[PDB]
Every structure is written in C-alpha cells, then in structure tokens.
Amino acid sequence: FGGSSHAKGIVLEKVGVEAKQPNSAIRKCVRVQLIKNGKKVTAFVPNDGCLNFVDENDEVLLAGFGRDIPGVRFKVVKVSGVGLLALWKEKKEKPR
Amino acid sequence: QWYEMQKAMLQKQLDINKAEYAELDEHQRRQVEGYRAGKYARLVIEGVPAEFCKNFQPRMPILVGGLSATEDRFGFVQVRIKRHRWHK
Amino acid sequence: VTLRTRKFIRNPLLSRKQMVVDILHPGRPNISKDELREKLATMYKAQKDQVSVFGLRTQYGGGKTTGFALIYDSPEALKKFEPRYRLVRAGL
Amino acid sequence: ARQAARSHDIKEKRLHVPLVDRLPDEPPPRLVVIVGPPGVGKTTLLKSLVRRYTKETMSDPVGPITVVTSKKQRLTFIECPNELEAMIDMAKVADIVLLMIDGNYGFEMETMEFLNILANTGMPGNVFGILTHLDLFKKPSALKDAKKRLKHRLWTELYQGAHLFYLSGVLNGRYPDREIHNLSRFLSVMKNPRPLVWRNTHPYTIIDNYRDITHPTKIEEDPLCDRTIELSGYLRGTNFAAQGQRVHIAGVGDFTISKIEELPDPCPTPAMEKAPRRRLDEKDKKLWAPMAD
Amino acid sequence: HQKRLSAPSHWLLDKLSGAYAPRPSTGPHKLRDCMPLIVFVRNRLKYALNYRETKAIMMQRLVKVDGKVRTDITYPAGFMDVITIEKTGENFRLIYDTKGRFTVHRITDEEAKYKLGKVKRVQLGRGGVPFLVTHDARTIRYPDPLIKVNDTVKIDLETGKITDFIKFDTGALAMITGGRNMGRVGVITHRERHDGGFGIVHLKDALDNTFATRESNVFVIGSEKPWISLPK
Amino acid sequence: EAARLDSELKLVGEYGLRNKREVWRVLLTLSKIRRAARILLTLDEKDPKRLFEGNALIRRLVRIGVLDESRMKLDYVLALKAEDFLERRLQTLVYKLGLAKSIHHARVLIRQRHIRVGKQIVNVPSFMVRLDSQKHIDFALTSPFGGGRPGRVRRKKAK
Amino acid sequence: PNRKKEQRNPRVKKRKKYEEKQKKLRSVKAVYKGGEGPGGYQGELSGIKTNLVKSVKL
RNA sequence: GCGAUGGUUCAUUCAAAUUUCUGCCCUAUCAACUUUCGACGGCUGGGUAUUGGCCAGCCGUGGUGACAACGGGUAAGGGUUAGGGCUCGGAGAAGGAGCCUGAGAAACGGCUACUACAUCCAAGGAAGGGCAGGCGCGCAAAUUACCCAAUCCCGACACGGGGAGGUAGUGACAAUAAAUACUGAUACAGGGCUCUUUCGGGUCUUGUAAUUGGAAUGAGUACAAUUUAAAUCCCUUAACGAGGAACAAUUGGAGGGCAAGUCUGGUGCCAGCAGCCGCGGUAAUUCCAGCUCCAAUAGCGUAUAUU
C-alpha cells in the first residue's frame, strides 16, 4: 500500500465471527477500511482469543504479513494506539 | 483524504444544525433545540428524598446525567466481561 | 596523616606562602581540610586562622591526597587577598 | 526516498476514527479533577491553583471552582474526595486530570484504581502526573532515583512520555509559586477535548450550587418528605430536552426535570463579552465558587 | 576578546588559560608586537594565579614599568621595557629568542637603569625645536644633532635624556624584530637602498647565514658591545 | 552456521565468558592487529616503514604478553589468535594462578573485589594483564582472603 | 511465560550448555582424560570388542 | 612637594575611509555596449575630513569590445603546509520621507508629519509597535535547571555591572565494559548418549524437586570527609547488604502429554478440529509442580520497501 510501511484503518466488520472452528483463518480475518486511500482490505488478527480486543469502529494500525486463506496480505499490529500483542499479553488496557 | 472528507461531512452536519434552528426564539431556540450546552442553568427537581438534604456534604459533588429513552427500560443486559489483571 | 610539602614558593608581593601539599591517610577516611588547617600551624609556625587549603583531590586507591595550601602573613592579609568562596569555606 | 517514507509514516500517524465533536461555540468550562490517595494534598493544590489564577486565598475550597484562564476558554477545578463512589462518578466526567502521587511513599492503589477506571470508562485528552512530598527526602540521590522510577511506572501505566511535574515544598501553607506557574503554563494553553461517544451523546451537568426550595409548612408537617431542589450548573453535554427530561442524580437516583431556567453566566470570559491581544488584564480573572469561600 | 589561538604566537599561552585571551590596551607599543602586563605577570612569570590576584598586585604600587607605576592590567609592554618589582627586588627585560618568541631576562639596577630605544623619526617641532621620536613613542626635545633615523639611543630613564647613540652601520650587529626571519641576532653586512619604497639590508649571523630583511624590521643592538645582557 | 556456533561455544566454555559479544570484541581487535600485520607484509623487506612499524608492532605484542618472546616475526603476528588473547585476559589468569578454583569462581572474585593487580583492586574481569604485571595478581588487603576483617557471613555467624 | 533459573543468567546458562556439550563429545569420540591412574593398569575397564575396526582408511 | 581633574600643538596607539597590479564558475540561442542618473577628459568652483564627474557652469569627442566587453545562468573561499585539525570571512528593526547625539551610526536609540493596526477612558483626551515557548489530527516522546566561580568585557572606578562561558538534568538512536552466582562432601538410583542402514548397530560413568557444608558479596541502604560559586558525579570511605516462596531476564520459534468437558464427520470402540470452560469447590485447590528442545541474550521480534 501507499508508500508507507504501516497503514491505519477502521474495523468495519469482523467477518467470520460466526465460524465454527476456533483458530480458522476465516475466524481470524477482519475486514478493515484504510484511512488514507479509502479501500476495504482484509487483515489477520494474530490469534482467535486476540480477536476479542478488536471492536467495531476502532483505529487500527496494520502491517504486512510476511511468511488457510493464502493471499490476505495484512496483519493487525496496533489497536487504538496500543500494541495488540501487549493487549493479548495483558500488559495494557485499551483506551476507548 | 478520506479522513478529512469524513470530518468535513461531520462539520457540514454541525453547520446545518445551528444554521437550521437559528430562525426563531420561542419556537426553535426554546422548544425545538432544548436548552443548549455551555449555558449556565438552574434546575428544579421535584421529589427528592429528605435523607439527601439531611446528609448533604459539599465535598462529594453532584452529577446530573440525562437518561435516554432506552436508559429507563429494564431487561437482561448481555455483557462481555473479564476480571481485572490485578484482582486477586 | 603523613605530610610532605613540594614546590614551596615565597610570593612576597601577594604576601602568601604557596605550597603543593601531598598528605597521606592510609587506612583512614579523608582528611577534613579544617583539621588540615589546624595541622598546618605548627608545621610552618603560623596561626591556624591565616591558612587556607583548596584543591585537595584524593589519589586513586586511598593514601595519597594532593592539596594546595596558602599561608598568609596575617589574617587581615588573608581577608584582603582571599576569594569570597574560599573565605566562606574557611569560615571567616 | 526516506523523507517520503517518514512523511507517509507521520501521515498515517495523524489519522483517527471520524467521531463527532459536539462542542458549542461558547464552550462550557473544562473540568479538571484533582485525584489522589488520602493525605496527598489535593485541597492544597486547589488553594494554590486558585490563588495563581484569581488571587483569592480560599481558606476552605469545596465544590467545583470555575476560573477564567483565557479570553476564549475557562476551567473548573473539582477535587475528588477519597471515596470510590466519587472517583467512579467523576472519571466519566473529567476533561483533564491532575493525578497525584505521594513521592517518597510511591504509588498507591487509589491512584492505580483511578487510572484504570478512567482508561476503561473513557480516556480524556490530558492527564498530568503531579508528584508531591518531595521535601520528605534526605538524600538527593534517592530523590532522583524515586523520580525516575515513578516516572517510568507512570509511563507504563498511561502512555510513554507523559508530563510529570514535581512540586517540592510547602512554604506558606500553599505551594511554590514557580512550580505551580509552570504547571499552569501546561494546563492553561489548551486543545479541544477528545470526542468521547458517551459525552457526545448524553447531556450531563455538574452541580455548582445547591439549594433546598421547600415550604417550611411542608417541613413542619412531615420532617422526612419529598423535597424540591434547585441545582445550578453548566449544561455540558448535548442539549437538555425542553420538557420532561429524565435525570440520574448520581448517588441519589432517577428523577425528572420540573424546571429549567436558562440564564447568563457568572464567569463571562471576554470573548462572550466582546461578542486580538494576548494578555489578560485583571478585570477578567473572575472566580465563581458558589459553594466555597 | 580574541581567542587563545587568534592571540599571536610570540607571547605564549598553554592549554590552560581558557579559550579566550586578553587584548592589550592601547598604548606605546603596537597590538601585534606586544606583551600585556597580565600575560607577563601570571602567564609568563606566574607570580599570580587569577585576574583578581593580578588586579590586587597591580592596583597597589608594586609594579613599575619603564620606571613609572603602571596601574591598569592590560598595559602594553612590547619591547625592552624594564619592569621593576621592588618587593622581589628584580628588574626584568624583554628581548626575543632565535625562534621568534618573547624572552624574559632578570637583572639588577645597573643595567636596569637605561633603555636602548630605536629612533623612529626626527623633526622640527613647535617652537622651532628639533625633537626625536623613538619606538616607545618617547619624544626627546633638543637631541644630539647626528642622531638620525634608525639610530638607537641609551635613554636615561630617571630623567629620560640621551646618553649615547649607536649609528646605523654596515658592520654593526643587529636584532631582527619582524618578518619571516624574525628574531635572529646577527651583523649588518650590507644595505640596499631600493628608492621608491621598501629598501632592504643583507645580514649574516655569527655563523654564516646570509638573509635579506627590511630596514623597518631591523633593530640595532650594538657593534660588538652588548649594551643589554642577551642571556648566556 | 554450526561451525561458528560451536567455535564460539568452545571459547565461551573454555574461558568463562558471559556471551558472544566478548568473543566478537576480541575477534575484532585481533582482526585489526592481523590486518596491520598483513599490510606491513605487503611491503618488501628492508623498507624503513616495514622495519620500524613491524618492530613497533612486535615489541607492543611481546610487551602486552600475547606473542611469545621466542617467535618475533610478522608471520607469527599473522598466526596470532583469539585463544591467545583470551588467555591474556585477567579472569583466566586468576584461574591459572590458582587463587580461584574454577574460571567462574575467578569471575566472581574479580567482580566482588578480592583480587588486585599491582596496587589497585580491579573490578573488571576482561582486564588485559600485561606480561610485566602478570606476577602481581594477589588478594587485596581488605579481602578476608588477604586480611583485615573476617567478613560478612563470618560476622553474622560469630555474633 | 515461565522461564528457567538457568535462563535468568546468561553466563550460568553458557556454563551448563558447555558442560553438557563436552559430555556429548565423550559419547562420540574418545577423550584422553589422563593416562594410567596411580593404581596402575586394572584392565581395559569397559570391554574389549574384537571385530571393530576404528581406523580412518586412507 | 607629591598626585587627581582640565588644556593648545605634535606624536603614538586603537581604528575608520579611500586607493594601485594580479586572481571569480560556466556560456556566444549573448556582438556590440556606454553616451537612457555624465559616457571619457580638461578648466573653474561647491560639498566632503580629504582626492575624485562626486556635484554644478564652459567646451572638446569619447570609453570598452572576439586577447572576449556586455548580457544571461545562480548552484555566493583565504592563511597556518607530514596529515587532519585550527583560524578569518549584504538588507532591516509596522512602511516610505525628513531630522537629533557622538571621536566613531545615516544608531533605528529617539523625535515630526503621512499611511496601517491596536490599548485605557469619566468620551473632552492619552500612551504603543521584539524574540523565545506550546498546538499546528481527536493520539503525545530532550530542562520553563544553577551561577559569574574560572577565561573575557564596560564604567568616576580594587568593590559595581555582563544572555559569551562554564556547571547540572533527560537519553535502548547509537556505542563501551558486564552482574543475575562460585565450590565441596555424602546418600540413592542404573542407565545416559548416538547413528548410515532402525524391530538393527555404536560408546561408557551419568542423573536427582535427594541430604548437608563452606566461603565470595556488588546492586542497594549509607555515617562522614572531599569535589564545587553552592550542589551533584568521580576518587577515598566506617557500618549494614543472598538462599529461590528470592535482591524475582527477556524476546522469538518448534514439539509432546490431559477430562464423567465441548464441536464436527461416519457402513459400532474410529478420526479431525481443539480444549482457561470438568461433578463439587475460590481460603477450594498444591496440580507436567515449576513440560521438552532450538536461537539471540540486556536485548529481541513483526510489517513493507527491498538489496
């Protein structure tokens, strides 16, 4: 995207919130809308229990995903100014 | 510049009101748009229990909030809860 | 408490005796330069009040301590020829 | 190329969610809480701040204290008492927070409780750590060690690189004037409050003046009866309803509005009086403490 | 208020006196041909430590320069000024060395009593009187009538009168006080006129090095006759 | 690579080092010395640059005790190594002089200020001890192995 | 996560890693480890196997 | 008699002003240029501190240029020589216009008028024109620190005054050194490890949440003295300061084990995804009791661009 390394976005809708199996990639993927350009791209939350911190209409930083749905390119790094792995590790509370 | 376009649409709505109820005092400014924010105001509350007036201390302040139409109904709230990190 | 004076200079126009002092406390803590002013009265046959000590950096590893000592001919010569901060540190 | 990369990173840093402002043209006074554990000197900072601003030595300042600090904006200081009901009542209310830490003693559970109550309820714009009781120290190496460790723990708590002021002594029973002058340099120039969803949808009010308007024949008949209460304050959220507004008086319960009188300000703040000079002449430094002395 | 490196290379300062250096006050000798009294007392001789100590020496009548009491601290004393300190009972004299720097010379009253000064110009002053201007800006009224330009004079320094003079001569040993061959005590053996500006002399040392220096930069010191004691 | 990992692990084990940063530090200064020796071998024999600069380098290494006093050629200066540098460290010198039982005991002693090199106590275990100063490694006077007070656990037990 | 007392100190971990990798080396090759003891030759103390050729065939 | 203050002239110093020859980078899609504020002289005066077309009257015919004038482009070094280093280097004080002081200014320090902002007032009047700091989204990151104590400067003058200078504070952006343990004895178990070739081969001392014993402390706490303008740091330094349940090492990656639990598939008992969730129980539980391995280790990972 763009010319930058990380993009910001709005979480439009957590697609695959009603998927059955817990660590499905359709369960982990989230449709976000990038601020700078306006397009809706899909991004992976790194973990299914870590999906619960991503709420609707939250400013979300996302980066590339460099390594079950092959081709979803982005991963959610920060949510509302706090790092998502820190939220998952219970280091910080999310400012809303 | 989708962010500034969205913020400009919000400011356009925030100009459309205060442009639309700037037309009459007794009808719009009093009855349509209520009692606008920032203005000092005196409230008369009827039916307060007398234990409040007997145990009124000036330290612990008074916060008046406005309930919505939905905030007076009762029912089963389904919530997403988690214990705190430092609660034993 | 062992004392040696190197580089003793007369300076009569400033009227004050200039000594590079190498003092040694082995095994003791530091030297307490007011007590060193008391010590530099009988070593050079003077009053304690007309001596001012400054410099006084302790060498590495204890023992040696290099100070600079000035003995004036009179306390009033000290008063008219000493800096304000050294006069305050001495106590006059 | 690297200039373009840094420009793109900052252009992505500037972005947020497009929320609604809901701030009027003549805005209400921004609410400054003075929160801390018991015995830390919140009332002392209140006395010192109101003497800095309006030059009035209050011997016992209670309630909200409204203060003109600029020609456009004004403040109001409320000291939270040491009860959790008041802390949870005012954490959803506060516009800027003055969060007090007790120096040599370190952090306290009331400070951490208010920090995470505020973060869970709604994070305001400006929270300033104020570290006091620094004069109860003997070694000024232990002093800077305590300042460093308290700064780093507060930075872990709220965000990295916050403002932590150090208020050293208590000279005239009040505070040092230079320390509270730079504290007021930081809390005087101001930016618009953060668009919180709860404050931008629901209309609230923090009562400046209380009065019991009840007939003494009713009080003589029934000593414990339903009374009528005049509560005077600034309307702060969205606008109240013109008739029949349902009210939650926090700590008492739900009632309905019997009357609203909309009347002019006691702190006029000269933009509203003139409706491009910098300084504030002493005509303008008003004090409206209708419960304090 | 010049820096320590912008101070000239012939009154020395070490890495010690701060980044700044005192400027000489206006007076008899020049700016770039100068030793101030503070550099002479506390930076060369080290009879003092600080500026305030140098002031406490100078303000009381303890330092006399060319036989008169000089009070101000940055008084210029460039060349051959006898500096009498009475509490130490010494008289210093300023000469140069072979490398091109200032040199101090301790001496007593017998050689301290006179000054060897080079004549700058002879003229007829007001009153129809001939007068004589040296390099110390000393003007002597009614001189000896052969003392022309570039001749040196033994000034009395207790009355200031003329006592003797040394003529500009091819065969009289001289001292260089300027130029790229600065400070080289040797004998004037040749002199070339170059009328139209900037004439020269050719001069050799005691041990056969010929070089050409300008007649402004020369300074006569004596034929053999070392009338001031150059340090042995 | 496994060769680099096994080599650095052999160094860190054989001389009681803390991490691989100390190994890379020694390898960097060894590569600097060896690069200077190769640049001096580039020139022909009996060039004055090679003569005086190689004599300076060889006298420096013999004086700091790395290079042996027997072999003094620039080819042996090229044949130098990191085992020789870590042998010239102080901590292995305490272990080899036998003031300590193991190399980790030696690092512990040098950290908590028991040995001294010459006159002053030495707080750092990577102190490059020279050949002239190798003999004067002993327990300090303020240490309970040297004298003075019987020490800490001794005081708590003898009370 | 919960980590080890060995992992909280980077020297002690590299001491125990070297002691166990010097131990794994004795199970592959043969270390010298002193010649005959003070007691003399008590036999080849752990077996002699006859049909085993352990020479690098050039 | 010795000085201080003052005075004419000549010096001298500190300056300032002009002034002589040489040296700018490129270009002819720049060959004519100057006389278009006189262009080159010489005479006479004016003004200047003085010379001078610098300016005014009179006349003469010039001056530069293909050896590169003129125009255009804007991208505005010298000295000290092993080296690097070190040293030196136009216009405005809201806008034009005019004036005042002094040795030195066309100070911008003041005045006057006009123009343009803007403040107090009792509505008659009256004073005034800089930088630094924060925000510059609603989301952020180096002190509003202390002193002239050294070096230096200005004055009736040893004392009075200095926004150069020095002192301190922050800092995982880097960079430097290296803590978080060292060492024994005894008891008990018989397996530990490896691989090409694997229901096979290779090698011989390894363990344990076992029981005990020794010492060694620097982080921190800290009396002092010292350092310093006053403090801090440093160096000295008396006294405390280690048994894990702590003085509490991290960041990543790979893998095993688990239920009277849950979900899904289907020619019974199988398989898969997985599993903080189980009958009870939260002052209840003591459990894989702290699971195993690999990498870096006070550092480490991810994304994108990539090379």
From Swiss-Prot, chain C:
Stated family: Belongs to the eukaryotic ribosomal protein eS24 family.
Subunit field text: Component of the small ribosomal subunit. Mature ribosomes consist of a small (40S) and a large (60S) subunit.
Subcellular location as annotated: Cytoplasm
One GO CC term, this protein: cytoplasm
GO biological process per UniProt: methylation; translation
Name the record gives this protein: Small ribosomal subunit protein eS24
Naturally occurring in which organism (per UniProt): Chaetomium thermophilum (strain DSM 1495 / CBS 144.50 / IMI 039719) (Thermochaetoides thermophila)
Keywords: Cytoplasm, Methyltransferase, Ribonucleoprotein, Ribosomal protein, Transferase
GO MF, any single term: structural constituent of ribosome
Top-level taxon: Eukaryota
